[PDB]
């Protein structure tokens, strides 16, 4: 599918739910043309990544 | 369904398409007026007053 369908279909609700995690820095995303999609959520330092 | 003559059956006159709710089983009122709302918790490690 195209970029706008993925962007208002998947990224909306996953980025909606991935607030409310404590100790965040910024929640950013990316919705590509060929059906790829990624969300890179960044935590402040002093948090064990596991 | 549709025949090769052109006569067809839409979802008109079979159904009544219109927007509604997921689950009608729970109904809530607030002093007579219909109401729904958010139950907001508190994340761990956060001051509640300015929250």
UniProtKB/Swiss-Prot annotation, chain A:
Q: What else is known?
A: Pyridopyrimidine derivatives, such as ABI-PP, are not exported by the MexAB-OprM efflux pump, bind tightly to a MexB hydrophobic pocket and so potentiate the activities of antibiotics such as erythromycin.
At the top level of its lineage, which domain of life is listed?
Bacteria
How does this chain assemble?
Component of the MexAB-OprM multidrug efflux complex, composed of six MexA subunits forming a hexameric tube, binding to a MexB trimer, which interact with the trimeric OprM outer membrane channel protein. OprM is thought to not directly contact MexB; instead, MexA joins MexB and OprM by forming a funnel-like hexamer anchored to the inner membrane. MexA may initially form a hexameric ring complex with MexB prior to OprM, then OprM undergoes a conformational change as it contacts MexA, allowing the periplasmic gate to open.
Under what name is this protein listed?
Answer: Multidrug resistance protein MexB
Task of the protein: The inner membrane transporter component of the MexAB-OprM efflux system that confers multidrug resistance. Functions as the major efflux pump for n-hexane and p-xylene efflux. Has been shown in one study to be involved in the active efflux of the autoinducer N-(3-oxododecanoyl) homoserine lactone, thereby playing an indirect role in quorum-sensing; but has been shown in another study not to be involved in efflux of this autoinducer. Over-expression of the pump increases antibiotic and solvent efflux capacities. Implicated in the secretion of the siderophore pyoverdine.
* Family statement drawn from the similarity comment of this UniProt entry: Belongs to the resistance-nodulation-cell division (RND) (TC 2.A.6) family.
The places in or outside the cell where this protein is found are: Cell inner membrane
What the record says about disrupting the gene is: Disruption of MexA, MexB and OprM significantly reduces active efflux of N-(3-oxododecanoyl) homoserine lactone/3-oxo-C12-HSL/PAI-1, but not N-butyryl homoserine lactone/C4-HSL/PAI-2.
State the species of origin.
Pseudomonas aeruginosa (strain ATCC 15692 / DSM 22644 / CIP 104116 / JCM 14847 / LMG 12228 / 1C / PRS 101 / PAO1)
- The full protein's residues present here are 52 to 101 of 1046
Originating gene: mexB
- What induces this protein's gene, according to its Swiss-Prot or TrEMBL record? By growth under severe iron limitation.
Curated annotation (Swiss-Prot), chain B:
Q: Where in the cell is it found?
A: Cell inner membrane
- Induction of this protein: by what? By growth under severe iron limitation.
Q: What happens when the gene is disrupted?
A: Disruption of MexA, MexB and OprM significantly reduces active efflux of N-(3-oxododecanoyl) homoserine lactone/3-oxo-C12-HSL/PAI-1, but not N-butyryl homoserine lactone/C4-HSL/PAI-2.
What additional remark is attached to this entry? Pyridopyrimidine derivatives, such as ABI-PP, are not exported by the MexAB-OprM efflux pump, bind tightly to a MexB hydrophobic pocket and so potentiate the activities of antibiotics such as erythromycin.
Quaternary assembly:
Component of the MexAB-OprM multidrug efflux complex, composed of six MexA subunits forming a hexameric tube, binding to a MexB trimer, which interact with the trimeric OprM outer membrane channel protein. OprM is thought to not directly contact MexB; instead, MexA joins MexB and OprM by forming a funnel-like hexamer anchored to the inner membrane. MexA may initially form a hexameric ring complex with MexB prior to OprM, then OprM undergoes a conformational change as it contacts MexA, allowing the periplasmic gate to open.
Family (UniProt): Belongs to the resistance-nodulation-cell division (RND) (TC 2.A.6) family.
* Role, per record: The inner membrane transporter component of the MexAB-OprM efflux system that confers multidrug resistance. Functions as the major efflux pump for n-hexane and p-xylene efflux. Has been shown in one study to be involved in the active efflux of the autoinducer N-(3-oxododecanoyl) homoserine lactone, thereby playing an indirect role in quorum-sensing; but has been shown in another study not to be involved in efflux of this autoinducer. Over-expression of the pump increases antibiotic and solvent efflux capacities. Implicated in the secretion of the siderophore pyoverdine.
Q: What is this protein called?
A: Multidrug resistance protein MexB
């Amino acid at each position: 599918a195209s970029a706008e369908t993925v962007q208002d279909t998947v990224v909306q609700v996953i980025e909606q739910q991935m607030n409310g995690i404590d100790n965040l820095r910024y929640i950013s995303s990316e919705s590509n043309s060929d059906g790829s999609m990624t969300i890179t959520v960044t935590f402040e330092q002093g948090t064990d990544p596991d | 369904k549709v025949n090769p003559d052109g006569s067809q059956v839409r979802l008109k006159d079979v159904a009544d398409v219109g927007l509604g709710g997921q689950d009608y089983s729970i109904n809530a009122q607030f002093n007579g007026s219909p109401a729904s709302g958010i139950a907001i918790k508190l994340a761990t490690g956060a001051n509640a007053l300015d929250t």
